[PDB]
């Protein structure tokens, strides 16, 4: 679902600083490619979804969400 970074979700890009999108995307894609379990399933959304969960995990690792709805690089 992501190709470079800007492809990320608005709710993501509208909260993620900069390298967080790469982290997000790179983490998402990682979980996407890793999602070889639900590759031949009609529920591909689950994959994309899980990737979202994963990517965020990376984001929540290198980035933190302030007391509003925005994030900033932690590590």
Curated annotation (Swiss-Prot):
<dbReference type="Pfam" id="PF06150">
    <property type="entry name" value="ChaB"/>
</dbReference>
<keyword id="KW-0805">Transcription regulation</keyword>
<comment type="similarity">
    <text>Belongs to the ChaB family.</text>
</comment>
<keyword id="KW-0804">Transcription</keyword>
<dbReference type="InterPro" id="IPR037205">
    <property type="entry name" value="ChaB_sf"/>
</dbReference>
<dbReference type="InterPro" id="IPR009317">
    <property type="entry name" value="ChaB"/>
</dbReference>
<protein>
    <recommendedName>
        <fullName>Putative cation transport regulator ChaB</fullName>
    </recommendedName>
</protein>
<comment type="subunit">
    <text>Monomer.</text>
</comment>
<comment type="function">
    <text>Might be a regulator of the sodium-potassium/proton antiporter ChaA.</text>
</comment>
